[PDB]
Each structure stands twice: as structure tokens, then as C-alpha cells.
RNA sequence: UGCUGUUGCUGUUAAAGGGUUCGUAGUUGAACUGUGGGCUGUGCAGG
RNA sequence: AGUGUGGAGAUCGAAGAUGAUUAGAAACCAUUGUAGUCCACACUGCAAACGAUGACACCCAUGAAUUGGGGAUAACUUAGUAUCUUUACGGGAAUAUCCUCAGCACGCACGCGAAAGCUUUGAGGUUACAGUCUCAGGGGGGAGUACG
RNA sequence: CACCAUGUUCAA
């Protein structure tokens, strides 16, 4: 069965990228889905995108640029400290310069240096760049 | 040949003389207890 | 204003390299398959006036035989073909 | 060793079913499963053309407008009796997959 | 492939310790028969007392007599 | 050219070859209709889909017979779709 | 390509110009569809063949014009035909156009093979049927030559960026389908004017047998 | 075998190719006139290429050769079917009628333009 | 002595492209070395034969020995070159290898570990270049670091001009023939990456056998 | 030595998916209760 | 296949017998023939028990088919079609065109792989390495042996 | 479709 939400919309999101669509169809929607949506909005990776309300665990449609190069969650969530950033960074992610580490804290879903800047650690969700 | 180089006799018949020392060696231990 | 800057403000990139107009997709030096397409413009009448629009193509879509869509898609988005016939 | 055919020889793809109950082979009788097995239906005629005619000659049945009688038969072939017999024949790779779905 | 669990540290744990005995080295170190085996019982030297000269012959393809000592 | 297929707004041919539940968003195939009966001459409701015994009020015969999909009204009765909505 | 900058309905389809392609027959396809030409599909026949949309027709044929009018540097732009159907076509548009042309049997390394004496370097290749010129077609692919392609419904569009969808079988009209490329590039170069029709007849575009 | 080898043959297209018009069917006077317009060594060698140029002569009367490219013959041709037609076919078309299917009549109708006039259905 | 025979050389010997850049700009094949040459000014291109090994094919008689040299070219500021080519004698096959070498040629993009102070000492992202089983990996390192890497990818790497890399190697890296063409491939990966500083929309320019068509039509014709 | 692999292995043919199914411990497990307005100033915001 | 107790025993046929072949042939070939082969009940749980490919779930390009059940005859507001049989398992049966869900598959784009090859049926979506669970492997032999 | 068994050790 299906375990994780977020993991099949970031691997659907990473598979349509790879493949050079314009649009692609999330199932099902969540919470946690929409907000990484929005972050990876917000830095420019993703362009519009609807959700479609079915009475039931709704439908994204997400309109896609050239500019997502991957996107995946990480399984387990892994808290991670403000120390631990830095290791994260080295792991996972391209470069210092570009990428973003998504997790999931207290003060809300953001991005690893907007958690770093308001000082506060969470759960690893993802990554994207 | 459908198989590759055995480097000794066929398999199967290499399991059968196991076997049979098997049965030797059991029969040998029952004889002394 | 495009590529790596310096902290003195000075691009340190070796060149820039041409993107794809339907996919964003960088075209490498060694694509040799991406193909750059000259579209005259027409003045008033029949016409071509003096200028051109160009499309690049790169080579993925091109083996893929997705080109003639997208340069389909990019003319019409840019206004050069019609995207459907008037009204009768 | 390598893998030499898609089928493995036989018309039983991995999901299809378990066991096709086999047959004895035409010529020497080897057990071979049917969808395995090299399968032929010959019509073969009864005479020669040359007995034919010296037979349809003598016959007040048989003739211009009455055709002699065929033989009709359903040959299974176990694979070293159909290569032996050269009614079928080791081919180059690429032309292995060469499939007729109708007697030529 | 293997699990992933949040909470599968005791299956990892587990799966690791069976598994270390499949490395030959690995399973030397931690047994007793090698050193059982071992007639200078783990030492890096041991001093003797030479019974006879002996001359082992190389093994093929060399050909050739190497001195050694029963001890 | 021609028109590109957008997923949040799917062409009318493109959604009505769809499945019930492959469509952008789930629905009924079914329906239900005003059935005049030959026999009783008088107006009941019935599933497009029935599978249980639809029967006239009146003269207690059978307005339809249950089949693998759509139920098959008898013959001589007058059948009106009635609106979903 | 009907539309300009300006708004102007003067490379629009006309009444003669749908009465010469329905008359040559080139919205007549092949009773076999490809995925990439579905789109240009209007609809299919009783007897099984598919009918090419004719407003489509026209909006690649003045993109095509519209990128050979472009190249500057006529004999940059090569027009092959192995069909030998086009063979004729070909060689009369290029006479008109000022074009490049091959016909018959394309030799492999033309375009690749760089010491051969025939090494030809063109800006721009427009090909008959993408089927049958599939050599010039990979060959193209290696040293970064866009092409023109008359494309019927089942044909294959790999490495193909202009796609005219018509009827590339037929002697009449491989030769119309040339015929009104050879008046746009002109009309659109201003070599000849629009009001007045071309004085060129189609019938020379024709295929003629050798007897 | 008596097969002409590839020399034989390139140079008797040569010959052919160039001399057309003193060549003949027959081969003494092909030979004779192949001795003054060919250099060679082997008396063999000319011989066969006369033989094998009689042979093309021939063909050609019949026909067109394949690697045999005789500059009249091409020109020729190519004005002969340069001559074009009165009127046009496609005009003649139009003016005897147009028939069209159903599917296009309906894609015609849609059309921004309209049907055109002689268009008909059939 | 150098006839060009294709619309680039003729350009680059009558001066009309200047730089590499405009080549790799437009994608197009190089099918001179010449054009190499000229395009790189004397002594800022070095060239080293990286390996030499024989290779056998059987035959009736014996087996017959040739010998397969791999080349590396560079300028060790951003452009790497690989070449392989096999021959009947070691010279023949060294000769040949740094021809297709130079014909081989491709950008590479530098770019910096942490602070953009100076010149890009390090690959801007991380790359994995594969050939055969032979995998090898290029991660960005701070300044000073050096080349942490095998001989052979050391050796292709300062060629290309990069100072401070990490790099981890997976498969039979002893297949030095396929180990150079993985680092070659790693190397040639940084510039199509595309990163947030590539986003912007580029004006398209012409391409130079396009603007340069009416002189090259003068060169065929005379 | 990513040849013990949590990071990080391999399992068609190189060593290695259990003959099949049920099944307890154990591991894992779908969506939803939701993130506010107003005013002023300011910023290629944008259509 | 093998075992136990009852049946059954035509055919074929381990063991065995005889005849050939052969330097030898207690093999292949020929004529036979016991146990078996078949059934009931009870054991055994050793297969190249194979797709040599674990289970569940997601994404995934193209053409022609096939089995079962249904439905219809500046990114556009809707874009056909029959044939044959036909006094009772018969308002029937099968074809034709289109759609659809489920199943065994074929030639077929990415991508992957040491390659052979795989490819919505992954061996793809993986050093840009994290959906969940579980089984097994760690150079070749000794050995699936010895002991318990 | 009678009957074809074998080739000392290294190294060219
Ligand atoms: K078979
Ligand atoms: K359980
Ligand atoms: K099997
Ligand atoms: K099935
Ligand atoms: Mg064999
Ligand atoms: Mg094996
Ligand atoms: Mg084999
Ligand atoms: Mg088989
Ligand atoms: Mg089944
Ligand atoms: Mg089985
Ligand atoms: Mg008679
Ligand atoms: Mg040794
Ligand atoms: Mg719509
Ligand atoms: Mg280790
Ligand atoms: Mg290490
Ligand atoms: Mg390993
Ligand atoms: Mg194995
Ligand atoms: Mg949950
Ligand atoms: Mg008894
Ligand atoms: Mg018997
Ligand atoms: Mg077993
Ligand atoms: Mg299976
Ligand atoms: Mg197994
Ligand atoms: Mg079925
Ligand atoms: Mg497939
Ligand atoms: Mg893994
Ligand atoms: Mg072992
Ligand atoms: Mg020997
Ligand atoms: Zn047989």
C-alpha cells in the first residue's frame, strides 16, 4: 500500500521533471504536500499549481518550469539539530551555493537556511534543487 | 551441452556417491551402538 | 547579469551556454544534434522586412521526435502560427 | 549459460500456466510438452502423380471430376527429431525471431 | 534491499550481527579454532628445538630443493 | 497547431472516454427514470442499474430484469430519464 | 505561419488555394496514424483513409516558407527526394528558389564525411518523406541541420522540426505541395507579387516516367 | 570464363563516353578507331575493350546505360520534358468539378473561407 | 598547408571566429584539429599520453598486435580534451590519439566551495562521469585542498584547470581506459547542470556559418 | 574496504528470493478539525 | 519418484533375462520382464518446485493483437458506423466501429546494465544513492560433509 | 543413423 503521501508527490513532481513535462497531476493531496509545494514555490522551482477538491484526499495540478532538477523526500524523517545543517548540506544536496533541505519544525514547514536563520531544528522531509 | 564446465563428475551422480557414503557411515555408527 | 559573479562583480564563467526554448534545457557543446531555426518576420504585405525570430531546439527532443510539437507550441505562443481557423 | 530465447523454446509465458501435459514425439517418441513441441499438419497426397494417373486411368470413380482422397496428419516433433529431419533448420540470430503464423 | 523503519534499530542490529560471521576474516578474529589450530597460539614468534634437516621440493613449474628444519 | 491538453481543464472528448473513477473528479454513471407501467398504468421510479426485483405497484409485474450492467425495462413501458439535478 | 507582427490577413488561405489542394488530393492520407501526426488528423473516410485538416495544412507550409525564406544564402538549403516522385518537384523548386537538391539514393557520409569531394554542408534539409530520406535524416543529426519534412499520417518525426502534413505519394501532389512552397518563398522574398497569379504551371513540377 | 574486368569496363565507358559519335556496331572499326583514341599497352586489353564498347553501343540503342552519361542524349531529354501543357491540369480539374468526401465536407464548412465554389459533394 | 575542408575550419583561418567559446556556443562538431591549434595561442595548450597498452586480434597465424593510446589535451583554464585511437605502431597511435584529442575538446565550469573571493577554484556542483563499471565522482572542496584523486583522474583534472576537488571512484578503476573517459565525462557534466544563476532568458544570437554564409559561398566559388 | 554497506553493498545469467499460501510477535500504515483581517507607507509585484 | 495397507494390473516399464553391436558393452538398438505405472486411505515434503527475476504501492512513450465483463451506435462549448442467421436455455446469437475496467502476452521511446539483454509485464524512475516489509549472499574448494 | 578409443611434462 501506499505509506507515504509526500513521498509519491515529490517522486511523481521529480519523475515529470526528469521527463520534461509542462504539467503533472499529484494523488492524493495533504497538508504536508501543499506546504512543500509553497516552499519550493516561493524560491521560484515550481510555477502555479491547483488543488482540486473531490470530497475526498484532493488533486494537485502543478504547472511545471525547466528549473526543478530533483526532488525527493527523506525516509525516515531524520530531526536533525541546528548543527546538524551543515552535515545535511554535504549529504544531500549539489552544492552550498544552491538546493534546499525542507524539514519540518515547530515554527512550521520551511527551508533548511530560514530554519537556520530563525534558530530552530525539526524533521528532515525532503529536498529539492 | 546446456551447462557450464563442472570442473568433476556430473553433479547429480557426485550427490548420489555422497548418498551412498551417507548411508554407509550411518549403517557403520549403528552396528557400533 | 547572466552566470557565475564574483565578489568584485565579475562573471567568471567560461561562456554561457543556450537554453531550450521548450524545455529550459541547457544545450551542451558536444549536443551536435540541437539546431537553431531563423523564422523571417512579414511586414504589412507578403513581404519579409529585415528581421528574424529564433528557436532552439535541443537535441534530446529532437531524437525523441517531440520537436515539430514543441516548435508548434512555441510559434504559437510567440504568434507567429495560428492556433486555430476563424470563424466561418 | 545465456539466455537464448525470449520463450525459452516453448509457447508458455511465465504467468500463462504451470504444466502443458506432453506428448510423444512423431518420430521417436521422446516426451516433449505440446507448446514446445515442432507441430506440422501435412496433407499429404495418396499417390504420385504418375500412380495417380495410371490409378485414376483404371478407376470408374476417380477422375477429371472426382479428386482422389489425402492423407491428413498432425505431426508433433520432439526439437532434435525436427532438426534432424530438416523440418526445421538452426538459424542466424537476428532471423530467429522470424515467426509464420500460416503454412507457406 | 533491507528495512527502513524509523523504530528498526533491533532488525538492523540483528541482521548485522548474523551477518558478520559470513566474513571470513571477520569470523577468524572472533573464534577460537584458528588459534586452537595455530601452533604458536597467537603468538608472533615462537622458539623450538630442530628435530631433522629436511628438503621440501618447490612446487611446479620451479624446480628446486628448499632447505627447511623439523621443529 | 493545435490546442495543448491541460490536466486541470480536460477537453469534453478527452473526459468523457475517461473511467468513472479515472476521471479529474469521480462520479456516477448511473441515473434514474420515470417508468410508465403497461400493465398498472401508473408512474415509478427505477435505477438505471437496478439488480433487485422493480416492481409495479398496481399490477405487481416486473418493470425491469436485472442484467450485468444496465437493467432492461420490459416492453411496452415508457422509460424518461430524470434529471441528475 | 499566418499571422504577423502587424495583424494582417495577407498570408491567410484563400479559396484558389483550397481549390488546388483539393483538387491535387493532398489532404488524403494513408488509412495509418502515427502518434506524433494524430494531432494533424481531422478526421477518417468511410473507405478508411484519414483527412489531413487543411487550416493545419497551411500554417506549417508558411512556417516552412517562412524558414526558407530566412536563409539569406540560397543553395544552403538542400531538398532531397528518394521517393523519385519528387525527383521532379525538387529540381523545379530549386530552379525557382535558387535551393540545393538531391535525388535518388542518398550516400551515407555526404554530410558527415569531410574529405570526400562531396562534402556538403547545408544550412537547412527539406526531404520529401521522412520513411524513405531516414539516412539524410540521421545523418542531419550529427552536424546540427534542422529539418523540413512533407510528413503524411504515419510518418516517424524523430529529428524532424517542421512536419507539413499532406499526401507525399501521389505524382500530383508532391508536385502541389512544392509547387506552393516554390510561391510562398517568391511571394514572400517579393520576387513575384501576390494579386497577379504565377505564371508557373504545376504540370512541370510533375513527375514524368523516362520513355 | 570470359568475364570483363573492371579495366576493361571502366575504359570502355570512357571510350563510349567520349567517342560516341564515331562508334558503331560493329567491332573491327570500334577496334580500329580505339587503337588511335586509347593508349595502352596489351593488344589484349584493346581488343576486349572494343568487344565490351560494340556491346555498350548496343545497349544503348536500346536504351539508357547505367555509368554511361552522353551530354546530347541528357539535354535531350530534359527539353523534351521541359514542354508543358496548354492549360494546367490542376486548373482543368477544377474546372471539370471537385468531389470530395463527406468528412471533408464537413472540415471545408468549418473552414474560416468556407466552402470553395466547384467543390461539391459525391 | 592547412586546406580546410568544412565551413569552421574556412571561418577560423580567415579569422572570422575568434574564440572556442563560439563553438561550443552553437554546439557544432570539429572536424579539424587545425582549428584547435589556431583557436589556442602557442604554449597555453599541453597535451600528455596517459596510457599506452597493447590489444591482440587471433587469426590463423597467430594474433595480431596493435596498440591503443589515450591522449589528454587541455589548457588547465576550462577546456579538456580526450582522445583514443588505435594503431599498427606506437607512434602512428600516439599521433592519431592527440588529434582526436583536440577534436574532442570541451568547456568546463569552475566555481567556488563556500566565499566567491578570486578565481573559480572548484567544480560548482557535484558530477559523475560512467563508462563501463567505472564510475567516478567529482564533489566540490574548499580552497586548498588539492586534488584529493586516483593518478589518472588527477592528472585529467589539473589538464581542465580545476585546483580543489573530492573525489570517490567505484568499479574496475584498474580499466584505466575506462577510467579516463569517466572523468572526461564528469568534467564535461558541469555545464549542463543548470543552477539558479543560469535561469535568466539569453538573447539567441546567429549563427556564425549563418552570418558568415555570403563569405563561405565566396570560398566555394573561388 | 561501498569486501558487513545506518550514511552505503549485492541477489535473471558472477555468491545469493524461501516451491506455494495462511499467519502471531515485530516493522510500517491514507485524508480531514489550519493558520485571520483592517489601515498607512513601501517594493519592475502582477493581470 | 519412493513408503504402508487394501484394490487393480490393458499399456509402458527401474531391477532382471535373452539377442545384437563392440577390443570390451551386465550401455545406447531389438525381443521381453519384476517393482511400478492406475484407484482408495495414510505417509514422504528431497525438483532446472524457473521468469534461475520476493510481496504491496506510485510514475512511465508507441503500433498491432488476444481472454472476460460492461457502455455507445494562447491551449476550444461537445465535432462517425454496419454485416449474417433467426420456430426456441431466444425482447436471441455472432460479427463491425469506438470507449472502458480486469487478465496472459507481442514488435516498442526514455532510461538502465559488464554485456547478453530489460523496458507501463523493468532488470527504468539509484553516488542527483531514503515508499513499506521480508528472505538470502560476502573468493574457490573441503560441503550441504562431520557432530548434535 | 553399423563401428571412429587415445595423444607424457614445462615452454615457443
Ligand atoms: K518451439
Ligand atoms: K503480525
Ligand atoms: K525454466
Ligand atoms: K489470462
Ligand atoms: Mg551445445
Ligand atoms: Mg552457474
Ligand atoms: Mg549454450
Ligand atoms: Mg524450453
Ligand atoms: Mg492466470
Ligand atoms: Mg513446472
Ligand atoms: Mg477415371
Ligand atoms: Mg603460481
Ligand atoms: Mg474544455
Ligand atoms: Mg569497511
Ligand atoms: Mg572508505
Ligand atoms: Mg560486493
Ligand atoms: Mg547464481
Ligand atoms: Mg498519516
Ligand atoms: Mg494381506
Ligand atoms: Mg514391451
Ligand atoms: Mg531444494
Ligand atoms: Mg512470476
Ligand atoms: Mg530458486
Ligand atoms: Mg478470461
Ligand atoms: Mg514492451
Ligand atoms: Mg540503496
Ligand atoms: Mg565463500
Ligand atoms: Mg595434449
Ligand atoms: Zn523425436
Given at each position: 500500500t501506499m505509506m507515504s503521501v509526500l513521498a509519491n508527490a515529490l517522486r511523481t513532481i521529480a519523475s515529470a521533471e526528469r521527463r520534461g513535462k509542462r504539467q503533472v497531476l499529484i494523488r492524493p493531496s495533504s497538508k504536508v504536500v501543499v506546504k512543500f509545494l509553497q516552499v519550493m514555490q516561493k524560491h521560484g522551482y515550481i510555477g502555479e499549481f491547483e488543488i482540486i477538491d473531490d470530497h475526498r484526499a484532493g488533486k494537485i495540478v502543478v504547472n511545471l518550469n525547466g528549473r526543478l532538477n530533483k526532488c525527493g523526500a527523506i525516509c525516515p524523517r531524520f530531526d536533525c539539530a541546528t548543527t546538524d545543517y551543515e552535515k545535511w548540506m554535504k549529504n544531500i544536496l549539489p552544492s552550498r551555493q544552491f538546493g534546499f533541505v525542507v524539514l519540518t519544525t515547530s515554527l512550521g514547514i520551511m527551508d533548511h537556511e530560514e530554519a537556520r536563520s530563525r534558530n530552530t531544528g525539526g524533521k528532515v522531509l525532503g529536498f529539492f534543487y | 551441452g546446456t551447462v557450464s564446465r563442472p570442473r568433476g563428475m556430473r553433479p547429480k551422480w557426485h550427490k548420489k556417491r555422497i548418498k551412498r557414503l551417507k548411508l554407509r557411515r550411518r549403517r557403520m555408527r549403528q552396528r557400533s551402538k | 547579469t547572466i552566470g557565475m559573479f564574483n565578489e568584485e562583480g565579475e562573471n567568471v564563467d567560461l561562456y554561457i551556454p543556450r537554453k531550450c526554448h521548450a524545455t529550459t534545457t541547457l544545450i551542451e557543446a558536444h549536443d551536435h544534434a540541437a539546431v537553431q531555426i531563423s523564422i523571417a518576420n512579414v511586414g504589412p504585405n507578403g513581404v519579409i522586412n529585415g528581421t528574424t525570430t529564433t528557436l532552439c531546439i535541443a537535441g534530446y527532443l529532437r531524437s525523441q521526435g517531440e520537436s515539430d510539437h514543441a516548435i508548434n507550441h512555441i510559434t504559437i505562443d510567440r504568434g507567429i502560427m495560428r492556433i486555430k481557423t476563424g470563424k466561418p | 549459460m545465456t539466455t537464448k530465447r525470449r520463450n525459452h523454446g516453448r509457447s508458455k509465458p511465465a504467468h500463462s500456466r504451470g504444466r502443458v501435459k506432453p506428448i510423444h514425439c512423431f518420430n521417436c517418441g521422446r516426451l516433449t510438452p505440446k507448446d514446445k513441441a515442432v507441430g506440422r499438419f501435412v496433407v499429404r497426397r495418396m499417390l504420385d502423380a504418375a500412380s495417380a494417373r495410371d490409378v485414376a486411368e483404371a478407376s470408374p470413380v476417380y477422375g477429371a471430376n472426382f479428386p482422389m482422397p489425402r492423407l491428413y496428419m498432425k505431426q508433433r516433433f520432439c526439437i532434435a527429431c525436427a532438426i534432424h529431419s530438416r523440418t526445421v533448420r538452426a538459424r542466424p540470430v537476428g532471423n530467429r525471431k522470424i515467426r509464420y503464423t500460416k503454412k507457406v | 534491499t533491507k528495512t527502513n523503519g524509523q523504530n528498526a534499530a533491533r532488525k538492523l542490529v540483528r541482521l548485522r550481527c548474523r551477518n558478520r560471521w559470513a566474513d571470513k576474516g571477520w569470523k577468524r578474529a572472533h573464534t577460537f579454532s584458528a588459534r586452537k589450530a595455530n601452533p604458536f597460539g597467537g603468538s608472533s614468534h615462537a622458539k623450538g628445538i630442530v628435530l631433522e634437516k629436511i628438503g621440501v621440493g618447490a612446487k611446479q613449474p620451479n624446480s628446486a630443493i628448499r632447505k627447511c628444519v623439523r621443529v | 497547431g493545435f490546442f495543448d491538453a491541460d490536466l486541470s481543464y480536460p477537453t469534453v472528448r478527452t473526459e468523457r472516454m475517461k473511467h468513472k473513477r479515472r476521471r479529474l473528479v469521480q462520479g456516477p454513471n448511473s441515473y434514474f427514470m420515470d417508468v410508465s407501467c403497461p400493465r398498472c398504468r401508473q408512474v415509478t421510479v427505477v435505477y438505471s442499474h437496478a439488480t433487485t426485483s422493480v416492481e409495479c405497484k398496481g399490477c405487481s409485474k416486473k418493470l425491469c430484469r436485472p442484467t450485468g450492467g444496465k437493467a432492461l425495462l420490459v416492453e411496452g413501458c415508457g422509460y424518461r430519464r430524470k434529471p441528475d439535478h | 505561419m499566418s499571422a504577423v507582427e502587424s495583424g494582417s490577413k495577407v498570408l491567410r488561405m484563400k479559396e484558389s488555394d483550397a481549390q488546388k489542394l483539393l483538387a491535387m488530393r493532398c489532404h488524403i492520407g494513408t488509412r495509418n496514424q502515427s502518434s506524433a501526426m494524430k494531432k494533424y488528423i481531422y478526421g477518417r473516410t468511410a473507405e478508411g483513409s484519414?483527412?489531413?485538416?487543411?487550416?493545419?495544412?497551411?500554417?506549417?507550409?508558411?512556417?516552412?516558407?517562412?524558414?526558407?525564406?530566412?536563409?539569406?544564402?540560397?543553395?544552403?538549403?538542400?531538398?532531397?527526394?528518394?521517393?523519385?516522385?519528387?525527383?521532379?518537384?525538387?529540381?523545379?523548386?530549386?530552379?525557382?528558389?535558387?535551393?540545393?537538391?538531391?535525388?535518388?539514393?542518398?550516400?551515407?557520409?555526404?554530410?558527415?564525411?569531410?574529405?570526400?569531394?562531396?562534402?556538403?554542408?547545408?544550412?537547412?534539409?527539406?526531404?520529401?518523406?521522412?520513411?524513405?530520406?531516414?539516412?539524410?535524416?540521421?545523418?542531419?543529426?550529427?552536424?546540427?541541420?534542422?529539418?523540413?519534412?512533407?510528413?503524411?499520417?504515419?510518418?516517424?518525426?524523430?529529428?524532424?522540426?517542421?512536419?507539413?502534413?499532406?499526401?507525399?505519394?501521389?505524382?500530383?501532389?508532391?508536385?502541389?505541395?512544392?509547387?506552393?512552397?516554390?510561391?510562398?518563398?517568391?511571394?514572400?522574398?517579393?520576387?513575384?507579387?501576390?494579386?497577379?497569379?504565377?505564371?508557373?504551371?504545376?504540370?512541370?513540377?510533375?513527375?514524368?516516367?523516362?520513355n | 570464363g570470359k568475364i570483363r574486368t573492371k579495366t576493361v569496363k571502366r575504359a570502355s565507358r570512357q571510350v563510349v563516353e567520349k567517342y560516341y559519335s564515331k562508334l558503331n556496331f560493329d567491332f573491327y572499326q570500334n577496334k580500329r578507331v580505339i587503337m588511335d583514341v586509347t593508349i595502352a599497352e596489351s593488344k589484349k586489353l584493346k581488343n576486349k575493350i572494343a568487344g565490351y564498347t560494340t556491346h555498350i553501343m548496343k545497349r544503348l540503342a536500346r536504351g539508357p546505360v547505367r555509368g554511361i552519361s552522353l551530354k546530347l542524349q541528357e539535354e535531350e531529354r530534359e527539353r523534351r520534358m521541359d514542354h508543358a501543357p496548354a492549360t494546367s491540369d490542376v486548373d482543368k480539374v477544377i474546372q471539370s468539378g471537385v468531389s470530395v468526401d463527406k468528412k471533408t465536407m464537413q472540415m471545408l464548412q468549418r473552414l474560416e473561407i468556407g466552402v470553395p465554389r466547384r467543390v461539391k459533394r459525391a | 598547408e592547412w586546406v580546410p575542408c568544412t565551413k569552421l575550419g574556412r571561418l577560423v583561418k580567415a579569422q572570422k571566429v575568434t574564440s572556442l567559446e563560439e563553438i561550443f556556443l552553437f554546439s557544432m562538431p570539429i572536424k579539424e584539429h587545425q582549428i584547435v591549434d589556431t583557436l589556442i595561442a602557442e604554449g597555453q595548450l599541453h597535451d600528455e599520453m596517459m596510457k599506452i597498452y597493447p590489444v591482440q586480434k587471433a587469426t590463423s597465424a597467430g594474433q595480431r598486435t596493435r596498440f591503443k593510446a589515450f591522449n589528454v589535451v587541455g589548457d588547465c583554464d576550462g577546456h579538456i580534451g580526450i582522445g583514443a585511437r588505435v594503431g599498427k605502431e606506437v607512434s602512428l597511435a600516439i599521433r592519431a590519439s592527440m588529434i582526436a584529442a583536440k577534436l574532442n575538446i570541451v568547456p568546463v565550469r569552475r566555481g567556488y566551495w563556500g566565499n566567491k573571493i578570486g578565481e573559480p577554484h572548484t567544480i560548482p556542483m557535484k558530477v559523475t562521469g560512467k563508462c563501463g563499471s567505472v564510475a567516478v565522482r567529482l564533489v566540490p572542496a574548499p580552497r586548498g585542498t588539492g586534488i584529493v584523486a586516483a593518478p589518472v583522474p588527477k592528472k585529467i583534472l589539473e589538464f581542465a584547470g580545476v585546483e580543489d576537488v573530492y573525489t570517490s571512484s567505484r568499479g574496475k578503476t584498474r580499466t584505466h581506459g575506462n577510467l579516463i573517459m569517466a572523468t572526461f565525462y564528469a568534467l564535461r557534466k558541469t555545464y549542463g547542470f543548470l543552477t539558479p544563476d543560469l535561469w535568466a532568458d539569453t538573447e539567441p544570437s546567429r549563427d556564425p556559418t549563418d552570418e558568415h554564409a555570403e563569405l563561405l559561398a565566396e570560398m566555394t566559388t573561388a
Open positions: - | - | - | - | - | - | 484519414h483527412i489531413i485538416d487543411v487550416h493545419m495544412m497551411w500554417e506549417k507550409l508558411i512556417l516552412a516558407a517562412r524558414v526558407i525564406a530566412a536563409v539569406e544564402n540560397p543553395k544552403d538549403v538542400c531538398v532531397c527526394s528518394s521517393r523519385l516522385y519528387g525527383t521532379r518537384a525538387i529540381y523545379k523548386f530549386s530552379q525557382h528558389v535558387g535551393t540545393s537538391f538531391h535525388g535518388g539514393r542518398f550516400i551515407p557520409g555526404t554530410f558527415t564525411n569531410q574529405i570526400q569531394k562531396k562534402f556538403v554542408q547545408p544550412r537547412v534539409l527539406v526531404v520529401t518523406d521522412p520513411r524513405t530520406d531516414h539516412q539524410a535524416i540521421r545523418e542531419a543529426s550529427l552536424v546540427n541541420i534542422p529539418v523540413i519534412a512533407l510528413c503524411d499520417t504515419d510518418a516517424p518525426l524523430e529529428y524532424v522540426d517542421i512536419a507539413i502534413p499532406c499526401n507525399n505519394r501521389g505524382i500530383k501532389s508532391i508536385g502541389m505541395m512544392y509547387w506552393l512552397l516554390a510561391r510562398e518563398v517568391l511571394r514572400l522574398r517579393g520576387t513575384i507579387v501576390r494579386s497577379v497569379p504565377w505564371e508557373e504551371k504545376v504540370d512541370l513540377f510533375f513527375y514524368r516516367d523516362p | - | -
